[model samples]
Target: MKEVEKNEIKRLSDRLDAIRHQQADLSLVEAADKYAELEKEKATLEAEIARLREVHSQKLSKEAQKLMKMPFQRAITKKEQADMGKLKKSVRGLVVVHPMTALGREMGLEEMTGFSKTTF
Candidate 1:
Protein backbone atom coordinates (compact mmCIF):
# COMPACT_ATOMS: atom_id res chain seq x y z
CA MET A 1 0.00 0.00 0.00
CA LYS A 2 1.07 3.58 -0.57
CA GLU A 3 2.04 5.58 2.51
CA VAL A 4 -0.96 7.89 2.20
CA GLU A 5 -3.41 4.95 1.92
CA LYS A 6 -1.82 3.15 4.88
CA ASN A 7 -2.05 6.28 6.97
CA GLU A 8 -5.70 6.70 6.01
CA ILE A 9 -6.45 3.10 7.02
CA LYS A 10 -4.75 3.63 10.38
CA ARG A 11 -6.82 6.77 10.97
CA LEU A 12 -10.07 4.92 10.13
CA SER A 13 -9.12 1.94 12.30
CA ASP A 14 -8.42 4.24 15.24
CA ARG A 15 -11.80 5.92 14.82
CA LEU A 16 -13.46 2.50 14.58
CA ASP A 17 -11.99 1.48 17.95
CA ALA A 18 -13.17 4.70 19.56
CA ILE A 19 -16.69 4.29 18.18
CA ARG A 20 -16.88 0.62 19.20
CA HIS A 21 -15.93 1.54 22.77
CA GLN A 22 -18.42 4.42 22.82
CA GLN A 23 -21.15 2.05 21.64
CA ALA A 24 -20.44 -0.28 24.56
CA ASP A 25 -21.63 2.36 27.06
CA LEU A 26 -24.67 3.84 25.26
CA SER A 27 -28.18 3.15 26.62
CA LEU A 28 -30.55 5.11 24.33
CA VAL A 29 -32.24 3.77 21.16
CA GLU A 30 -30.70 6.54 19.05
CA ALA A 31 -27.31 5.68 20.42
CA ALA A 32 -27.93 2.03 19.61
CA ASP A 33 -28.83 2.90 16.01
CA LYS A 34 -25.83 5.12 15.69
CA TYR A 35 -23.68 2.36 17.12
CA ALA A 36 -24.99 -0.05 14.49
CA GLU A 37 -24.21 2.54 11.83
CA LEU A 38 -20.69 2.87 13.15
CA GLU A 39 -20.33 -0.91 13.09
CA LYS A 40 -21.40 -0.96 9.44
CA GLU A 41 -18.86 1.76 8.59
CA LYS A 42 -16.14 -0.16 10.45
CA ALA A 43 -17.01 -3.27 8.45
CA THR A 44 -16.62 -1.30 5.22
CA LEU A 45 -13.25 0.03 6.37
CA GLU A 46 -12.15 -3.50 7.28
CA ALA A 47 -13.16 -4.72 3.83
CA GLU A 48 -11.06 -1.97 2.22
CA ILE A 49 -8.10 -2.93 4.37
CA ALA A 50 -8.50 -6.58 3.43
CA ARG A 51 -8.77 -5.70 -0.27
CA LEU A 52 -5.64 -3.55 -0.24
CA ARG A 53 -3.76 -6.20 1.72
CA GLU A 54 -4.74 -8.85 -0.80
CA VAL A 55 -3.43 -6.68 -3.62
CA HIS A 56 -0.08 -6.31 -1.87
CA SER A 57 0.17 -9.92 -0.66
CA GLN A 58 3.17 -11.93 -1.85
CA LYS A 59 0.96 -14.81 -2.90
CA LEU A 60 -0.46 -12.82 -5.83
CA SER A 61 -0.13 -14.39 -9.29
CA LYS A 62 2.24 -12.90 -11.86
CA GLU A 63 -0.53 -10.94 -13.58
CA ALA A 64 -1.86 -9.54 -10.31
CA GLN A 65 1.67 -8.57 -9.27
CA LYS A 66 2.21 -6.79 -12.56
CA LEU A 67 -1.06 -4.94 -12.11
CA MET A 68 -0.06 -3.81 -8.65
CA LYS A 69 3.32 -2.54 -9.85
CA MET A 70 1.88 -0.46 -12.69
CA PRO A 71 2.28 3.28 -12.36
CA PHE A 72 -0.64 5.69 -12.43
CA GLN A 73 -1.19 7.18 -15.89
CA ARG A 74 -3.77 9.84 -16.70
CA ALA A 75 -4.98 11.15 -20.04
CA ILE A 76 -6.92 14.27 -20.92
CA THR A 77 -10.02 13.49 -22.95
CA LYS A 78 -11.04 15.56 -25.99
CA LYS A 79 -13.63 17.36 -23.89
CA GLU A 80 -10.89 18.35 -21.43
CA GLN A 81 -8.51 19.65 -24.08
CA ALA A 82 -9.53 23.27 -23.73
CA ASP A 83 -9.29 23.20 -19.93
CA MET A 84 -5.86 21.56 -20.16
CA GLY A 85 -4.62 24.24 -22.55
CA LYS A 86 -5.89 26.98 -20.25
CA LEU A 87 -4.21 25.37 -17.28
CA LYS A 88 -0.94 25.06 -19.14
CA LYS A 89 -0.99 28.72 -20.12
CA SER A 90 -2.07 29.94 -16.69
CA VAL A 91 0.61 27.93 -14.93
CA ARG A 92 3.33 28.77 -17.44
CA GLY A 93 5.33 30.89 -14.97
CA LEU A 94 4.99 28.35 -12.16
CA VAL A 95 6.72 25.05 -11.51
CA VAL A 96 3.68 23.14 -10.38
CA VAL A 97 2.48 19.52 -10.55
CA HIS A 98 1.53 19.06 -14.20
CA PRO A 99 1.19 16.03 -16.43
CA MET A 100 4.17 17.21 -18.50
CA THR A 101 6.60 16.38 -15.71
CA ALA A 102 5.23 12.85 -15.33
CA LEU A 103 4.89 12.18 -19.03
CA GLY A 104 8.30 13.62 -19.80
CA ARG A 105 9.92 11.40 -17.17
CA GLU A 106 8.07 8.35 -18.45
CA MET A 107 9.04 9.02 -22.04
CA GLY A 108 12.66 9.97 -21.25
CA LEU A 109 12.10 13.27 -23.05
CA GLU A 110 12.77 16.85 -22.03
CA GLU A 111 10.12 18.39 -19.81
CA MET A 112 7.26 19.81 -21.88
CA THR A 113 4.03 21.55 -20.95
CA GLY A 114 1.86 20.45 -23.86
CA PHE A 115 -0.34 17.51 -24.84
CA SER A 116 0.65 13.89 -24.46
CA LYS A 117 1.23 11.60 -27.46
CA THR A 118 2.17 8.46 -25.58
CA THR A 119 0.02 5.34 -26.00
CA PHE A 120 -0.43 2.36 -23.75
Candidate 2:
Protein backbone atom coordinates (compact mmCIF):
# COMPACT_ATOMS: atom_id res chain seq x y z
CA MET A 1 0.00 0.00 0.00
CA LYS A 2 1.08 3.57 -0.53
CA GLU A 3 2.40 5.51 2.45
CA VAL A 4 -0.55 7.88 2.38
CA GLU A 5 -3.02 5.00 2.43
CA LYS A 6 -1.18 3.36 5.30
CA ASN A 7 -1.15 6.61 7.25
CA GLU A 8 -4.85 7.08 6.66
CA ILE A 9 -5.61 3.60 7.92
CA LYS A 10 -3.62 4.26 11.04
CA ARG A 11 -5.37 7.56 11.54
CA LEU A 12 -8.82 6.00 11.18
CA SER A 13 -7.95 3.13 13.48
CA ASP A 14 -6.71 5.54 16.11
CA ARG A 15 -9.85 7.62 15.86
CA LEU A 16 -12.01 4.53 16.18
CA ASP A 17 -10.18 3.56 19.33
CA ALA A 18 -10.49 7.06 20.74
CA ILE A 19 -14.23 7.11 20.07
CA ARG A 20 -14.62 3.78 21.78
CA HIS A 21 -13.00 5.18 24.90
CA GLN A 22 -14.60 8.61 24.73
CA GLN A 23 -18.09 7.23 24.34
CA ALA A 24 -17.83 5.99 27.90
CA ASP A 25 -17.31 9.46 29.42
CA LEU A 26 -18.93 12.00 27.12
CA SER A 27 -22.51 13.25 27.23
CA LEU A 28 -24.93 11.87 24.64
CA VAL A 29 -24.75 14.95 22.45
CA GLU A 30 -20.98 15.15 22.62
CA ALA A 31 -20.65 11.45 21.88
CA ALA A 32 -23.08 11.67 18.97
CA ASP A 33 -21.13 14.47 17.33
CA LYS A 34 -17.87 12.62 17.67
CA TYR A 35 -19.47 9.41 16.46
CA ALA A 36 -20.73 11.04 13.28
CA GLU A 37 -17.32 12.53 12.57
CA LEU A 38 -15.58 9.24 13.17
CA GLU A 39 -18.14 7.36 11.12
CA LYS A 40 -17.48 9.59 8.14
CA GLU A 41 -13.77 9.06 8.57
CA LYS A 42 -14.27 5.33 8.83
CA ALA A 43 -16.30 5.23 5.61
CA THR A 44 -13.64 7.13 3.74
CA LEU A 45 -10.91 4.86 4.98
CA GLU A 46 -12.93 1.85 3.93
CA ALA A 47 -13.37 3.22 0.44
CA GLU A 48 -9.65 3.92 0.20
CA ILE A 49 -8.86 0.38 1.23
CA ALA A 50 -11.35 -0.98 -1.29
CA ARG A 51 -9.68 1.00 -4.04
CA LEU A 52 -6.29 -0.29 -3.02
CA ARG A 53 -7.58 -3.84 -3.03
CA GLU A 54 -9.01 -3.39 -6.52
CA VAL A 55 -5.60 -2.30 -7.78
CA HIS A 56 -3.91 -5.09 -5.92
CA SER A 57 -6.31 -7.63 -7.33
CA GLN A 58 -5.64 -6.45 -10.86
CA LYS A 59 -1.95 -7.22 -10.30
CA LEU A 60 -2.42 -10.63 -8.72
CA SER A 61 -0.82 -13.67 -10.29
CA LYS A 62 -3.14 -15.64 -12.56
CA GLU A 63 -3.26 -18.58 -10.19
CA ALA A 64 -4.06 -16.36 -7.23
CA GLN A 65 -6.82 -14.67 -9.16
CA LYS A 66 -8.29 -18.01 -10.06
CA LEU A 67 -8.09 -19.11 -6.46
CA MET A 68 -10.18 -16.16 -5.38
CA LYS A 69 -12.89 -17.28 -7.79
CA MET A 70 -13.77 -20.49 -5.98
CA PRO A 71 -11.65 -23.01 -7.82
CA PHE A 72 -12.96 -25.64 -5.41
CA GLN A 73 -16.54 -25.45 -6.60
CA ARG A 74 -16.26 -28.71 -8.51
CA ALA A 75 -14.33 -30.56 -5.81
CA ILE A 76 -15.81 -29.36 -2.53
CA THR A 77 -19.21 -30.51 -1.36
CA LYS A 78 -22.04 -28.02 -1.73
CA LYS A 79 -22.27 -27.74 2.03
CA GLU A 80 -18.61 -26.82 2.22
CA GLN A 81 -19.06 -24.09 -0.35
CA ALA A 82 -22.00 -22.69 1.62
CA ASP A 83 -19.91 -22.67 4.76
CA MET A 84 -17.12 -20.82 2.95
CA GLY A 85 -19.58 -18.19 1.79
CA LYS A 86 -20.78 -17.66 5.35
CA LEU A 87 -17.20 -17.30 6.60
CA LYS A 88 -16.45 -14.79 3.88
CA LYS A 89 -19.48 -12.72 4.77
CA SER A 90 -18.63 -12.69 8.45
CA VAL A 91 -15.17 -11.25 7.76
CA ARG A 92 -15.99 -9.05 4.79
CA GLY A 93 -14.56 -5.54 5.05
CA LEU A 94 -12.98 -6.06 8.44
CA VAL A 95 -9.39 -5.58 9.58
CA VAL A 96 -7.62 -7.65 12.18
CA VAL A 97 -5.44 -6.30 14.98
CA HIS A 98 -3.71 -7.71 18.01
CA PRO A 99 -4.15 -5.04 20.70
CA MET A 100 -2.66 -7.06 23.51
CA THR A 101 0.62 -7.84 21.82
CA ALA A 102 2.15 -6.02 18.82
CA LEU A 103 4.76 -3.77 20.33
CA GLY A 104 7.34 -2.50 17.82
CA ARG A 105 5.29 -3.77 14.91
CA GLU A 106 4.20 -1.49 12.10
CA MET A 107 1.22 0.76 12.98
CA GLY A 108 1.78 0.16 16.67
CA LEU A 109 1.53 3.51 18.36
CA GLU A 110 2.58 4.11 21.95
CA GLU A 111 -0.79 5.70 22.58
CA MET A 112 -2.58 2.71 21.05
CA THR A 113 -2.22 -0.77 22.44
CA GLY A 114 -2.78 -2.85 19.29
CA PHE A 115 -1.05 -3.59 16.00
CA SER A 116 -2.91 -3.70 12.70
CA LYS A 117 -1.89 -7.16 11.59
CA THR A 118 -4.01 -7.55 8.48
CA THR A 119 -6.95 -6.22 6.47
CA PHE A 120 -9.53 -8.24 4.61
Candidate 3:
Protein backbone atom coordinates (compact mmCIF):
# COMPACT_ATOMS: atom_id res chain seq x y z
CA MET A 1 0.00 0.00 0.00
CA LYS A 2 1.03 3.61 -0.49
CA GLU A 3 2.61 5.39 2.49
CA VAL A 4 -0.23 7.90 2.72
CA GLU A 5 -2.87 5.18 2.88
CA LYS A 6 -0.88 3.26 5.47
CA ASN A 7 -0.58 6.38 7.62
CA GLU A 8 -4.28 7.09 7.33
CA ILE A 9 -5.09 3.54 8.42
CA LYS A 10 -2.87 3.93 11.47
CA ARG A 11 -4.50 7.24 12.32
CA LEU A 12 -7.97 5.71 12.04
CA SER A 13 -6.96 2.79 14.24
CA ASP A 14 -5.70 5.17 16.94
CA ARG A 15 -8.95 7.12 16.77
CA LEU A 16 -10.96 3.92 17.15
CA ASP A 17 -9.00 3.00 20.26
CA ALA A 18 -9.54 6.42 21.71
CA ILE A 19 -13.26 6.23 21.00
CA ARG A 20 -13.49 2.87 22.73
CA HIS A 21 -11.88 4.22 25.89
CA GLN A 22 -13.90 7.47 25.85
CA GLN A 23 -17.28 5.78 25.60
CA ALA A 24 -18.59 7.78 28.54
CA ASP A 25 -18.16 11.05 26.62
CA LEU A 26 -20.54 10.09 23.81
CA SER A 27 -24.05 8.59 23.87
CA LEU A 28 -24.29 4.83 23.33
CA VAL A 29 -25.95 5.24 19.90
CA GLU A 30 -23.35 7.78 18.70
CA ALA A 31 -20.47 5.59 19.86
CA ALA A 32 -21.83 2.47 18.14
CA ASP A 33 -22.28 4.28 14.81
CA LYS A 34 -18.79 5.76 14.95
CA TYR A 35 -17.27 2.42 15.85
CA ALA A 36 -19.01 0.63 12.99
CA GLU A 37 -17.86 3.22 10.43
CA LEU A 38 -14.24 3.10 11.54
CA GLU A 39 -14.28 -0.72 11.62
CA LYS A 40 -15.55 -0.92 8.02
CA GLU A 41 -12.84 1.48 6.75
CA LYS A 42 -10.09 -0.35 8.63
CA ALA A 43 -11.14 -3.73 7.21
CA THR A 44 -11.19 -2.38 3.64
CA LEU A 45 -7.72 -0.87 3.92
CA GLU A 46 -6.36 -4.06 5.50
CA ALA A 47 -7.73 -6.19 2.66
CA GLU A 48 -6.13 -3.91 0.07
CA ILE A 49 -2.78 -4.12 1.84
CA ALA A 50 -3.02 -7.95 1.92
CA ARG A 51 -3.75 -8.12 -1.79
CA LEU A 52 -0.83 -5.85 -2.65
CA ARG A 53 1.56 -7.83 -0.45
CA GLU A 54 0.55 -11.13 -2.06
CA VAL A 55 1.29 -9.73 -5.53
CA HIS A 56 4.69 -8.41 -4.38
CA SER A 57 5.52 -11.77 -2.75
CA GLN A 58 4.75 -13.68 -5.93
CA LYS A 59 7.11 -11.46 -7.95
CA LEU A 60 9.90 -11.86 -5.38
CA SER A 61 9.46 -15.66 -5.35
CA LYS A 62 9.78 -15.87 -9.11
CA GLU A 63 12.93 -13.74 -9.13
CA ALA A 64 14.43 -15.77 -6.26
CA GLN A 65 13.81 -19.04 -8.12
CA LYS A 66 15.53 -17.69 -11.20
CA LEU A 67 18.50 -16.48 -9.15
CA MET A 68 18.88 -19.85 -7.38
CA LYS A 69 19.47 -21.59 -10.71
CA MET A 70 22.60 -19.51 -11.29
CA PRO A 71 26.04 -20.06 -9.67
CA PHE A 72 26.55 -17.89 -6.58
CA GLN A 73 29.92 -16.20 -6.11
CA ARG A 74 31.44 -14.38 -3.12
CA ALA A 75 29.98 -11.15 -1.78
CA ILE A 76 30.75 -7.86 -3.53
CA THR A 77 31.14 -4.60 -1.61
CA LYS A 78 29.56 -1.22 -2.53
CA LYS A 79 32.91 -0.13 -3.99
CA GLU A 80 32.80 -3.22 -6.26
CA GLN A 81 29.32 -2.35 -7.56
CA ALA A 82 30.84 0.12 -10.02
CA ASP A 83 33.46 -2.38 -11.20
CA MET A 84 30.77 -5.03 -11.52
CA GLY A 85 28.83 -2.77 -13.88
CA LYS A 86 31.88 -2.49 -16.12
CA LEU A 87 32.43 -6.26 -15.96
CA LYS A 88 28.82 -6.96 -16.91
CA LYS A 89 29.50 -5.44 -20.31
CA SER A 90 32.12 -8.15 -20.96
CA VAL A 91 30.20 -10.91 -19.11
CA ARG A 92 26.50 -11.31 -19.83
CA GLY A 93 23.77 -12.04 -17.26
CA LEU A 94 25.75 -10.99 -14.16
CA VAL A 95 23.53 -10.32 -11.12
CA VAL A 96 24.94 -8.57 -8.04
CA VAL A 97 23.06 -7.96 -4.81
CA HIS A 98 23.44 -6.47 -1.35
CA PRO A 99 22.33 -8.65 1.60
CA MET A 100 20.27 -5.86 3.14
CA THR A 101 17.88 -5.72 0.17
CA ALA A 102 14.61 -7.66 -0.01
CA LEU A 103 15.72 -9.67 -3.05
CA GLY A 104 18.98 -10.64 -1.34
CA ARG A 105 17.09 -12.00 1.70
CA GLU A 106 14.68 -13.86 -0.57
CA MET A 107 17.62 -15.53 -2.35
CA GLY A 108 19.15 -16.50 1.05
CA LEU A 109 22.17 -14.30 0.44
CA GLU A 110 24.09 -13.63 3.70
CA GLU A 111 26.02 -10.64 2.34
CA MET A 112 26.76 -8.82 -0.87
CA THR A 113 26.43 -11.54 -3.51
CA GLY A 114 26.82 -12.14 -7.23
CA PHE A 115 25.29 -14.81 -9.49
CA SER A 116 25.90 -15.75 -13.08
CA LYS A 117 25.21 -18.42 -15.65
CA THR A 118 28.91 -18.71 -16.47
CA THR A 119 32.20 -18.14 -14.59
CA PHE A 120 34.22 -14.93 -14.95
Candidate 4:
Protein backbone atom coordinates (compact mmCIF):
# COMPACT_ATOMS: atom_id res chain seq x y z
CA MET A 1 0.00 0.00 0.00
CA LYS A 2 2.75 2.43 0.90
CA GLU A 3 5.19 1.50 -1.83
CA VAL A 4 4.61 -0.24 -5.16
CA GLU A 5 0.84 -0.29 -5.06
CA LYS A 6 0.58 3.45 -4.45
CA ASN A 7 2.88 4.39 -7.32
CA GLU A 8 1.22 2.06 -9.80
CA ILE A 9 -2.19 3.36 -8.77
CA LYS A 10 -1.07 6.95 -9.27
CA ARG A 11 0.28 6.27 -12.74
CA LEU A 12 -2.80 4.39 -13.88
CA SER A 13 -5.17 6.98 -12.39
CA ASP A 14 -3.37 9.82 -14.15
CA ARG A 15 -3.49 7.99 -17.44
CA LEU A 16 -7.18 7.28 -16.98
CA ASP A 17 -7.88 10.93 -16.18
CA ALA A 18 -6.04 12.11 -19.29
CA ILE A 19 -7.99 9.67 -21.43
CA ARG A 20 -11.22 10.85 -19.83
CA HIS A 21 -10.61 14.61 -20.14
CA GLN A 22 -9.76 14.55 -23.82
CA GLN A 23 -13.24 14.24 -25.37
CA ALA A 24 -12.72 13.56 -29.03
CA ASP A 25 -15.56 14.23 -31.53
CA LEU A 26 -14.02 12.92 -34.79
CA SER A 27 -12.78 9.59 -33.47
CA LEU A 28 -15.29 6.71 -33.42
CA VAL A 29 -13.34 4.62 -30.90
CA GLU A 30 -11.96 6.88 -28.18
CA ALA A 31 -10.19 3.65 -27.53
CA ALA A 32 -12.65 2.07 -25.10
CA ASP A 33 -10.23 -0.81 -24.47
CA LYS A 34 -7.53 1.60 -23.37
CA TYR A 35 -9.85 3.25 -20.88
CA ALA A 36 -11.16 -0.03 -19.46
CA GLU A 37 -7.70 -1.54 -19.06
CA LEU A 38 -6.25 1.30 -17.03
CA GLU A 39 -9.46 1.75 -15.04
CA LYS A 40 -9.60 -1.94 -14.17
CA GLU A 41 -6.04 -1.96 -12.95
CA LYS A 42 -6.69 1.14 -10.86
CA ALA A 43 -9.80 -0.34 -9.30
CA THR A 44 -8.09 -3.60 -8.39
CA LEU A 45 -5.14 -1.80 -6.85
CA GLU A 46 -7.34 0.28 -4.53
CA ALA A 47 -9.43 -2.75 -3.56
CA GLU A 48 -6.35 -4.62 -2.44
CA ILE A 49 -5.02 -1.56 -0.63
CA ALA A 50 -8.27 -1.24 1.33
CA ARG A 51 -8.44 -4.94 2.10
CA LEU A 52 -4.85 -5.04 3.30
CA ARG A 53 -5.41 -2.18 5.74
CA GLU A 54 -8.20 -4.02 7.53
CA VAL A 55 -6.13 -7.18 7.54
CA HIS A 56 -3.11 -5.25 8.76
CA SER A 57 -5.07 -3.97 11.74
CA GLN A 58 -5.63 -7.52 12.88
CA LYS A 59 -2.00 -8.54 12.49
CA LEU A 60 -0.68 -5.17 13.65
CA SER A 61 -2.44 -5.39 16.96
CA LYS A 62 -0.84 -8.74 17.70
CA GLU A 63 2.58 -7.35 16.83
CA ALA A 64 1.85 -4.27 18.89
CA GLN A 65 1.07 -6.49 21.84
CA LYS A 66 4.45 -8.09 21.38
CA LEU A 67 6.14 -4.70 21.04
CA MET A 68 4.66 -3.64 24.35
CA LYS A 69 5.99 -6.79 25.92
CA MET A 70 9.53 -6.16 24.69
CA PRO A 71 9.67 -2.56 25.97
CA PHE A 72 13.43 -2.27 25.43
CA GLN A 73 13.61 1.42 24.83
CA ARG A 74 15.70 4.56 24.42
CA ALA A 75 14.75 7.95 22.98
CA ILE A 76 15.98 8.44 19.46
CA THR A 77 18.64 10.82 18.21
CA LYS A 78 20.42 11.14 14.86
CA LYS A 79 22.03 7.82 15.67
CA GLU A 80 18.65 6.27 16.47
CA GLN A 81 17.00 6.66 13.06
CA ALA A 82 20.38 6.72 11.36
CA ASP A 83 21.30 3.26 12.57
CA MET A 84 18.17 1.80 14.16
CA GLY A 85 16.87 0.25 10.98
CA LYS A 86 20.23 -1.45 10.70
CA LEU A 87 19.93 -2.44 14.34
CA LYS A 88 16.47 -3.95 13.76
CA LYS A 89 17.75 -6.10 10.94
CA SER A 90 20.86 -7.16 12.85
CA VAL A 91 18.92 -8.09 16.00
CA ARG A 92 15.41 -8.65 14.65
CA GLY A 93 12.11 -7.05 15.81
CA LEU A 94 13.71 -3.83 16.96
CA VAL A 95 10.78 -1.51 16.22
CA VAL A 96 11.55 2.20 16.51
CA VAL A 97 8.23 3.78 17.43
CA HIS A 98 6.89 7.24 16.60
CA PRO A 99 4.35 9.17 18.65
CA MET A 100 2.00 10.45 15.96
CA THR A 101 1.58 7.38 13.80
CA ALA A 102 -0.57 4.31 13.39
CA LEU A 103 1.78 2.06 15.27
CA GLY A 104 2.39 4.75 17.86
CA ARG A 105 -1.35 5.19 18.46
CA GLU A 106 -1.78 1.45 18.59
CA MET A 107 1.13 1.16 21.02
CA GLY A 108 -0.10 4.03 23.19
CA LEU A 109 3.42 5.31 23.80
CA GLU A 110 5.82 7.99 22.64
CA GLU A 111 9.41 9.35 22.46
CA MET A 112 10.49 7.21 19.56
CA THR A 113 10.38 4.14 21.78
CA GLY A 114 12.11 0.99 20.70
CA PHE A 115 11.12 -2.59 21.39
CA SER A 116 13.99 -5.04 21.52
CA LYS A 117 16.70 -6.27 23.87
CA THR A 118 15.53 -5.35 27.36
CA THR A 119 18.90 -3.98 28.37
CA PHE A 120 22.05 -3.81 26.20
Worst 10 residues of 2 by lDDT: 111-120
Question: CA lDDT of 45 in candidate 1?
Answer: 70
Off by over 4 Å in 3: 1-30, 61-90, 101-109, 117-120
Task: Tell me the lDDT of candidate 2.
Answer: 0.48
Off-target runs (Cα >4 Å) in candidate 1 are 1-10, 27-30, 58-120
Q: 2 or 4: which has the higher TM-score?
A: 4
Between candidates 2 and 3, the lDDT winner:
3
- Each candidate's clash count: 0, 1, 0, 0
Error of 2 at 111 (Å): 44
- Per-residue accuracy of model 3 over 17-47 as CA lDDT, tens digit each: 6755655465647768865665666577567
The lDDT per prediction is 0.54, 0.48, 0.67, 0.63
Query: Model 1 RMSD to the real structure?
Result: 13.8
What ordering of candidates by lDDT runs from best to worst?
Answer: 3, 4, 1, 2
Q: List the residue pairs that clash in candidate 4.
A: none
Error of 3 at 91 (Å): 2.8
Task: List the RMSD of every prediction in angstroms.
Answer: 13.8, 15.4, 7.3, 8.8
lDDT of 1 by residue, 1-120 (tens): 455856876787788788778777764576767767777887887788678767646635454344335443243445545566564455442222234565345434443323222222
TM-scores for all candidates: the values are 0.35, 0.31, 0.44, 0.36
State in Å the error of residue 26, model 4.
56
Per-residue CA lDDT of candidate 4, range 21-114, in tens? 6423213367577656656665776687668756765555576657656646565666757886676776566657787887676657666777
